[model samples]
Every structure is written in C-alpha cells, then in structure tokens.
Target: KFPRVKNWEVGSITYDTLSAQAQQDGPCTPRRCLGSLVFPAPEQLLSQARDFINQYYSSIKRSGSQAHEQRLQEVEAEVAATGTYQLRESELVFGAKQAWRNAPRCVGRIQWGKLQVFDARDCRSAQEMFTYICNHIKYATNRGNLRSAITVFPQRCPGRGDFRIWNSQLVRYAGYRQQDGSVRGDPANVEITELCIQHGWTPGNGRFDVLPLLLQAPDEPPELFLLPPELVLEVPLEHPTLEWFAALGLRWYALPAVSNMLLEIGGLEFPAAPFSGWYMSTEIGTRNLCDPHRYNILEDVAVCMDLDTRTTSSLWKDKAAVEINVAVLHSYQLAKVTIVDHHAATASFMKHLENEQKARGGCPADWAWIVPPISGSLTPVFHQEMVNYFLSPAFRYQPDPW
Candidate 1:
C-alpha cells in the first residue's frame, strides 16, 4: 500500500483572529464574583489565616516526636482557639452541615485545601469555614485510617489476568431513590450492603448497616438525615451526589485508595483472644486477640463494638448509675446484626452461650464439642459488662492528675 501527501503551505488560508467573549467582559472584577475568595482590605486577617494553616500543614509534616495523633490534636487546639474548623477522620468527604434543603440548593464542588474553602457560600469567614470543616470533615491522613485515604493502589484488585485491572475494593456504597424524583446525595443515605463479597464470606457476609449507627440517635431516621455537624450526608438517587454512577438499585463502591493508606498505619493488629481473635490467629485456644486481616474487613464491626461500648457506658454514667434507682434495670435489646451465615448461628446463640461460658470460665457445653464457632456471641455479654461496670455508682475511677 502507498500513501500520498495531501497539503502544502502554498494554499492561501484566512483565519479569524477574534476571540470568543467571556460570560462577562474582562478587567477589574469585583471581589465576590471572583471564582476564589482571596481576602483583601484587612491584609492582617488574611495573613493570620494563612499563617495558622501553614503551621498546621507544617505540623502535619513533622514526624517521630509528634506523630499523627499528637499533631492532629495540636491542629485541633489551634483551630479551636481560633474558632476555626479543622478536618477530622469522619468528616473528610461530607461538610459540616447536612440537611435537606427547603429550596433548590445543592452541594457544589466541595473540596478543602490549605485553609481554603471552595464552592461553599454558607461560610462567612475563614474561621467559620475552618470550624465548619473541622466539625464535619475527618482527614484520612493516618496510615492506619486508610478507610478515608485518597490515594489509590494499582494492585488492590483481587483477580489476576493478562487484562487484569485492579478495582479497588473496601467500602461498598448502596445508592437509593427517594419518593420524590430529587436525588439524595448523603453518604449516610448510602448503605454498605456487602462489605467483603470477594472473599466469599469466608470471613462471612460483610453486611454492615453503617448509616443507622452513624446517624444521630432515636429521633433521626437513618435514611432521611445525617448526624449533627454533618460528617456524612445522604445522597439522592437520580441526581446522584457522586458523579458517573450507573444504576437504579444501590451500588457498592469501595475506597481502595483510603484503605491502602490505613494499612500503612501501625498497631492495627487484631486483638488476641480465641473468641475475639478468631479472624487473626489460627491457633486453637487463644484469648481476646483480633485478626489482622480482619482489621480492614471488620472495621464496621469494630466501630460498632466501640460505639456500643461507649453508648453503654455513657448511658449508665449519665443516667442509670445515679439518676435511676430501680429494682430491675436492663439494657436495650439487641436490634439487628450483620455477620456471616456461618457466624449467624453462633452470634444468634452468643448471649446465652456467653453467660454459660462466663459462668464456667472455660469451654462451655454450648460451644465445646462443635468446632467452636466465632461470632458476636460475646458482644452482648461484653456490652452488658460494660453497662454494669459504669452503672454502679461505686465504679468511679478518676484519672491521675500529676
């Protein structure tokens, strides 16, 4: 096959030099109309804001002496002193306020960068914006907290092949459509239906209801609203908050990027008791140790456990211990649980079995002969113990003030 050359410069050409006009004519734009707000006039105010943010970033970059936690606390204190918002782990994606708008208002290009708030008009001052962000956003900066990290790992995808592409898997989001045609963009509205389906639930069906747990208690419906300070929001179905989504039913989206970041953090090892550490150690009879691999898989479970424990303690310390003097006081009944089918039978019978196990203080009759199943069997008992420990007025122990 032969190719022929087509064009020569000898052909006379006329091109239009006129440029397309912008929406508004250029030159001397007003302050508010500018895409980004750069505080003028009071130069000292802007300088203060910039200095504080730079210090915060510098503090974040420091290592050894003040690792992440200490640095984060310092940032928190700094922001608090200035009455500005600082980012936290839980509030990274969602802004500080979460609610359904009465009028036609929507979140637009939400982002955070070095004390700068973009596409957020509700913010009046740098302090207000910072405070709002701090209240609502959680930075997934810690290595162990990869669930919120933004970087992606190329090899995270499971199946390997010549044409293999790693689809980052971690948190699965389920999209929903409300009664009205308007889309709900709240992350809290998105449910995590399948936490780990790839591993075939060997770790068990990773079904966790993150929405309800993260929501404000009682009065707030899980689907309708977010917890105060808007750490997470509800996403509309049609006018989806997230872009390029495809589906009528809910789809599970994982944060592989963030998950990888979490893996870098140290001390995320599983607790080591056989009953608790079943996911970690294959050793026959260990006690209280959690599995390391299960760390990421069971993050929701761990979070739930922590929440239940905290709530149990708070309720007792706040009201039950001192306020109420009752002959018969009991904790809230178990509402719902998410675990594997294999673990289901075990978790279902956990409470009764746990009581017997505790009474015997060894392998109980209920779990002895049968390849002792690992489930949420001890969760209720543990929660009960937590409640009881805090409920007693004499259980008070104050911290040592040196």
Candidate 2:
C-alpha cells in the first residue's frame, strides 16, 4: 500500500508507491520512528552494481536493450573476476547526477540536471587531488556566477587507504577559540580550524578567514594547501535599505562546495568526490548565520536593528532575520553572484518533486529537510507530507580520515 500523502494548503492528495521500494535498512520500524535524522546508506556489491546499471540504462531509455544487457554482463564479469569493479566513464557521470537527485535534503535539487561531473578517478596523490579541486572551484565558482559541479578522485580500495578531503566545505571560515571560552570566528568550523592549525596551517585572526584544504591520498598524511585568493568569490553582506548593515562586515563565500561526503556509484566508494552548488539565501542568512551553534548573529543583528530585545512577542528575531536574509540576497546580487531566495528555491524544489513524481513513482523527501529553515508554513513544502527513503548511486558521509 502506498502512503496517502496529503497537502494541507492545497488539499491535494497522492499515494507514494516509491515508498514501497524503500531500503530495507530504514531508520524507522513499527515500534519507533527516526524520520527526522538526516544521513542514511549500502548493498551486496554485484546486486547494487546490477541495480545501478539498470538505473543508468533506464535513465537513457535503453532498459533491457542489447547494450544494457551487455553492460550488466560486463559489470558482473568484472565483479566475478575482481572482488570490486570500476565503473565505466559514462556510468560515473550518470551515477553522479543520480546521487544528487537521490539526495533528500538538498533544496537545490531543481538544478540537479545542471551539475558538472569531473571524473578525476586517476588522481594518484594529495597534490594531484588539490589541482583537481582548484580547477573544480574555479569552474564551479565561475567568478561568482556559480555552477553545480563535482570532482571525483580515485575510489577507495583494499590495496591501501582512501583519498579524502578533511574540510567539510571547500571554502569555510576558520574558528579560533578565545581564552575567554568564546570563538572569534565561525563556531561551526572550530574543530576544523583546530585541525588546520594542528596540521601546520598558520591561522588568521578574523571571523571570515578561509581555511586551507586538508587533502589525503592513500597511506600518507594529508597535506594542507591554501586556496588561491582570487579563486574564492565572496560577497560582503549589505542590505538594500539598511545602511548600517554593511558596517557589520559580514561576508560569505559564493560557492558552497561540500568536500566531505563520499560518492558511491555502482558499489564503488569514492571518498574524495567534492561537489559544489550555489547557495540559497536562507542557508547563508538563516542557518549558517543565525543558528546558535554557528555564527549566531540573530541577536546581534536584532541589537543592531534596535528591535525589542526583551520581549519575544515583539518578534525582534523574526524582524531582524528577514532583513538579514534580504541582506544576503542583496549582497550576492550586488556582487553579481548567483543566489536563490528561499521563495524561489522552495518553489523550484516543489517543481522538482512534481517532475520526479512523473519520472519515478515518487521522490524521496525528508519533510523536515525539504522545509526551509527560515519559513516553515510560508513555503508550499510545509503542507506536503513527503516520504523519505534511501536510494543508491548515492552520496554518503564517511568517517573523518584522521
């Protein structure tokens, strides 16, 4: 039986047959449910390989054709000979796109078809991985007209160790711990910042200091490399109407290149596949800046705006937050950088959900995740009951190489 999903706002109803094919190792069971937690994955190699090959072929409208069968046989043959097998060049690209499509939390899934997949599977060392990374940044940043892209380094194998990027994001500010038990920079990056310093990176004394990449290849220690300053496109936050906002000196990197997630394609685990996509205004303004554990600038911005600080009913946080979100969007636009406002992003995701429903039986979506951090009810997604599930040819979080 399909999940009878209903949209409260529109009074629309649909049954999700896709939920039937959900992964057997789901977080939820009959007794209890863990539906809100984010990260979830694997497979019996050949079985996973077979399914991914099927997905790739079906994607190209060649299901059960001679070419499709031949490819499946080829994969099976290779897996039978060697315990693990390599994915074909075309298969790698398809899997990369599928991984993005399969990601449940990404509000930017509307741009899934536009991702630039860079196959760097032949990368032999951390140095070579850094080069591929720099190029990925340069290409994806597009000098602020950001493009969605990923650079896949060599896959993990039993021979040695895995190629990995220690940085969660390719571009992130350093978090320096102060003697007074406070952090001078982005608190979200404190551990990473300490890691960089421990690995010989000279830390900078600023809230927006861009940290170096800790690139690791095989059994050797990871090497630190600073991103070329010119390659990092950043926009200083400023509001359209609020002149004082610019004086706060807040800025964020343009490209949101996530480097830590492992990309699995046809059962092959690529530990060093770093992917970049443009940001939504709310992600930068609301979550990254306003979250208590992060920059936590909501109270600061409220104080600057001179809103009613003592009374929660006055909704000072709400008022200040909207403006900060506005500032984020305005700043990126002023700098000619690509950024989607929450309205546009959420709307786009709704369209993507519809598209996926037509393409597949349904699109696996985490209702908690698909809903924007800033506005829950304001967006259409809040009204839609989404079914979350695991899908293969997926990106998964691997443990830190340290």
Candidate 3:
C-alpha cells in the first residue's frame, strides 16, 4: 500500500487531498455559482428598488421628504415607460456605494462610500468607451496610491443584448499556451489572449504583457483597443533581504479593475461597468503566485530559501509561501502603493460587520472569500458565522463573451 509509483508527478498526493477538500468546501457552492446567473424578475426588481429608495432617504435623515417622494415617482415613471428604470446621478452614486456595501465577497467594503463613480452611459462608440476606461485607470492609479472607482456604461435595453467588456480585468497579462500544453504567463487570461490574437492583435512574449481590451456594444462585433503603457502602473516585486527574489521576474499592476462582471442595480444590468479597488497582498501572494493552477512557485521559492522539499513534514511550501507574501507586502509598501495585509483587512471587516449590523441589521458575507487562503484559522473572520444572501445593486459574475 505504501509502494511508490515510477513516473508520477511531484506533489500528486498533496494535490489529491487539495482537490478533495476543494470539492467539499471550495468557493463554488451551488447557490453561489448557479444562482448568480439567474436574473431577477421584474417584481423582485421593483421591491428591491423601493427598499433601496427608502433606505437611501433614511440615511440622509430625509425619510418621507418631498425629495424622497419625487424620487419614488421618477422610479415609477421610468419603469412604466421602458420596462426598466434609470438611476439619477446622485442615485447612481449611492447605488454604487450600496453595491460595494452589499458585496459579500469583498473584505474591503469599509471604504465603499468613498468610491468615485464615473458615469459614461453616453459613450456610443468603442473608442469613446476606451477613453473613459483610460481616464478611470489614470484616476484610480493616482501615481502609486490607488483609489476605488467604477466606470459605468449604458444599461441593457429591450431587443438588444448588453454591452460587455470581454477582458476579465481592464489590465491583465497574456497567457500563451505552448506546444507541450504549458502556459507562459497568467494562465487565467488564456481565453482573452486567444480572443485578442484572433481579432488581429499581436501579443508580446513576456511575463507581464498587458492584454488588449475587447469592447462589445449591443448586437455588434467586439472591437479591440490597446491600453497605453503610461496609464498602466506596475510594481516590480523584490524582497528586502533576498536580492535574488527580484530575478524571479514577478510583478503586478497597481489597480485591479474588474471589467467582465455585471453591475445589477434594481434588476437593471450594466454589463460594461468596470470597478476597481486597491490590492490585498495575499491576493497576489497566496493566490496568483502560489495556487497550483496559477504561477505555482512554491517549489522554486522553497529551493531559493534552501528548504528541504523531500517530505511534507518539512513544511517547505508553507515557509516559502510566507516569504512570498512578505515580499508582496514589502515590495508594495516600498513602492508607496496602497496594499492591505490579510490581518488588517479582516480586522477592519469585523468592524464593518458590527457597524452594518447596527445600520442594516446584518452583514452579508461569503465565508470562503472573507477568510484569507493562507491563514484561515488565524483570521477573526474564520471563526465568525456569516450568512450570504442576494442584495440589489450588487456585483455578479457574468458569462464571458467570445
């Protein structure tokens, strides 16, 4: 039973355990996964909009005021006019903030109210959309200090498909599949890279090649636009003590502008709304770098640190992961980039939960996402009980547009 098989891959045993555990308790629960694709009905939209309107007025201490009544009338008029409604500038701002607040998967929702909303609904062409996105990147990047922002395009209309950004993010590296079925860089972006290549865009051969944006308006073929290098800010990863760490050639963009997700406000979907937040160190360290499906740099890092990789009991992977996380935090801090550690992020989230409980009765949270991947038991969120549910004006994942 203990015999070893020849030609077996390294870490196959550990992979088996990891795979089994993932199947049992990973992020993709049936409700969270399948339920996200089901769009809300008209009645549900009306109900959520009314509740949000009421809450919005109450927040400003103007419940039942003339302004509140007028706003409700406008919502009713729009719904009757077009089978959907529009949010006013003030209302749109509030909705964006509320969307972040209602986002159960984010740990940094404490800064929800501070998000800058860029309304680009009037953008008619792919070029105009590209300009708006460029502006968003410049404003959010803010040199090294990143800010949270969302650039919203037009909403979905009847008899027309939704406008969409095909890229997973406004900025991402190209992933080239080799002849041997190995990825060159950022395996998460393979599909987008192929899409770009098919659309007559030449991709560069490098670890940090930024992918072009695929802008698809309603019922039209997607147009491709390349992001200017000046607008995209990246931080070179280096360790404070280990000089060789820089040679690993690892780096990441300062802003995380998610472009593919749908922003559902009162059941009206804006499929081209791209939002961003400052980086959390572990997102790059524990996930992008360490995940088996990602960079998978544990063994390389372990060997660099002179750790024994012969046995699981040595905990070489864990040691290397800790160093990798340390490098990410340290490097970002050195570059004056806004980055949150897992401990600080979770602590602030706990405070946010308490505040939300007093304001909204309870906070919605997905336990899997709220807890950091590397140090689950060490974080306060891991021990806490969380209930995840649907809330209007929330961000939901949408299917990729080919």
Candidate 4:
C-alpha cells in the first residue's frame, strides 16, 4: 500500500526520480545539441574576392589588368552557378598568406607572406590524405629546422559532407586512460585516444607515444594510419645549467601543425586544411607543461628547485615557471630548432602591426590571445590597445564533427 496526500484546496506535487533519470540519459538530445557550421555567405565571398583581386593586380603593378577583370567575372559566375567560387594556385597562395596576416591571435604573423602552400585538392581517399599529411610533416619538420607550411584539401560541396582530418595536429602524443580513471599521458588527448582505440588501433603506455593519424573522407567512416617515427623530429628537453631537469624525461615535437582549423578565403571554406609554424617557447613551457589541465609540473619543478612551497608570498611558482621557460628556450636553441622566445615574438608582432597599418588601413588583433601567458606586463603587446574584427581570408575555429 502507498500513502497518498489528499489536499482539496491545493494540487499535490510529486517527484519522479525514474523520469528524471531517463531525461539525463544519452549523449544529448537533438534540440539541445545541434552541431555548429561555419561557411561564409555568397555576398561576403564576392566582396572579398573582388578586394583580393584588386589588391593582387595593384601589387604586381598591373592595376585594372584584363586577367583581374576576367577572374572577377569567373568568381561571380561560379558563385551564381554553384553557390561557391574556386581560387587559382596563385590566388590560393596569396589568400593563405593574407589569412595568416589577418589572424588576430597569432604573434608570428610577421612570417605570414613566407608560408609554403601545398595544394592537395585532388586527393580523394583516406590513404592519399595520410600520404599528404606525412609529406607535410616531413617537409615542415625539415629534420628539426621547422618551416611554416599549409596543405589545403578539397573544399565542401553541395549535398556532401566535408573531408576532415580528425587529429588536432599531424603529430600528437596519445593519452591512455588507466584502470583507476586517471590519464597516463596528455590528458587533453584522451578523447582522441579513445576514438583511435574504438577504430582498431593499439595505444602504447609511454609518455611520448605518437598517436596515429585519423583521416575521414566525406560520407565515410574515419580510418587510422600510423605515422613513421623517423619523419617526426623531437627535442629532449634539458636546461643549460640545471642538471636535475634532464632526469624528468621531458620532450616535445619540433613542429606545431594545427589540422583542425578551417581556412576561409573569399568566403570559401576548406575544412581539412593543416598549417604549421615554428614554436613559440611559452606555448610549450608555460601552457603545455605547466597548465593544470595539462602536464601540471609546476609543483614538481618548484620542489626540485628547492623553493619555498609553504606560502604564496615566496613567489615559488613564478620562479619555477620562469626557469622551466628558460629551459625550453635553451633546449630548442641547442637543438637548432626554429623557436622564438616571447619577447622576440611580441616585438616582431609590433613591427608587423605597424607595417600592416601602413599597407592596410588597420590590423586585426585579439588582445587576450596575442599577449603571452607569463610575464604579460613586461611585453610590449601588453601595453598596446587592440581591436579585433572579421576580415576576409581568415582562419576560423569550426565545430568538431560528431
């Protein structure tokens, strides 16, 4: 028998734990969880293409050239017919450079015009994508002397999903989840590692295990391929003066290839574009090695350095972070890798801003991302005011594929 409340004057409220539990089940409902899509509108693309063509002709001292006018007409017709336009090899190269220059978050934009563009738009299969990615890794790595490069795959078309590479970079370390639910390696890569396992790939139990590439073609399942270790160049982290730091067994890859970002040119979107630049020291030292969600080695370094850990007033964490950053700079320099310290990177960015200001009307910059995480106040970028706005030929963050 169950007891019931009989209230004549008021309605009774009941709690259904089973119903509530049912609501919480599954990944997420369709209404509440819609995947994000980012593609430029037709008009936006037309305007950007026109501007880019005009600028291109002017730069070559061929203003109002018949070739420029013909290309503009072609873009207008293509957009009318297929809702998108194509970029020629020269146009693509220029667009890639401008995309890097217009990137608000990068402090390394001074090297934008020098990016190597590899057009792999003809690639159709996962195997081809793997080969292309491998070639990119080897070429950019250059056996430890990194060069900035981007590989552009085919663009998204009507009635078909886009081609995509699942890995955040062409090379990354796997993160294995142990029995106790703690991640054994890079905690940030746990999801990707699990996906690789689900797709029939074996993961190793090592701190620096290089994860395989997961390539996905449109309207098909993702496939995994192992990267040849010889193609990847890495530097074992060590300090110039600190002897104990070498025992920590820390190392990082020479190239920083970002594969997940979408490259937009004249309103066209290339979903599987992978671009890389030389490393900025703080990217590895301050964020990847010290962030709580990442390696979280601040306390360990502080303890090893014999700094006071009892109180925040001792500035132990700051001291340790600085030394770790120093070690990263020192190690990369010793390896002859193309790495830049925060000071030099930021200083170069300031000069780039001035150059862009003279060349273009203004420069787009994101203050938060442009500033270094450590020693923010000391950098010239910290004191400068920045304004960020959308411009054509930009690199944008796109939603992860479900």
Q: Highest lDDT, which number? A: 2
User: Where does candidate 2 have its weakest 10-residue lDDT segment?
Assistant: 35-44
- Worst window of 10 by summed lDDT in candidate 3: 14-23
Q: What is the C-alpha RMSD of each candidate to the true structure, in Å?
A: 30.2, 1.6, 9.6, 14.2
- What is the C-alpha local distance difference test score of candidate 1? 0.22
* lDDT tens digits by residue: candidate 2, 152-189: 99888887898989999999999999999899889989
Give candidate 2 misplaced runs (Cα > 4 Å). Answer: 38-43
| Regions of candidate 3 where Cα sits further than 4 Å from its true position | 1-45
Q: What are the per-residue Cα lDDT tens digits for candidate 4 across 206-267?
A: 88888998899888899889988898888889988889998999998899999999998766
Best-matching candidate per TM-score: 2
Q: Tell me which of candidates 2 and 3 scores higher on TM-score.
A: 2
Candidate 1 per-residue C-alpha lDDT over 50-153 given as tens digits, one digit per residue, 9 for 90 to 100: 43334334435544344544645555565446544333332221211110000001111011111111222233332343333333233321211212222111
Output the lDDT of residue 173, model 3.
Answer: 92
Question: What local lDDT score does residue 27 receive in model 2, on the 0 to 100 scale?
Answer: 82
All candidates: TM-score = 0.16, 0.97, 0.89, 0.87
The window of 10 residues in a row where model 4 has the poorest summed lDDT is 15-24
Clashing pairs in 4: none
CA lDDT of every candidate = 0.22, 0.89, 0.82, 0.82
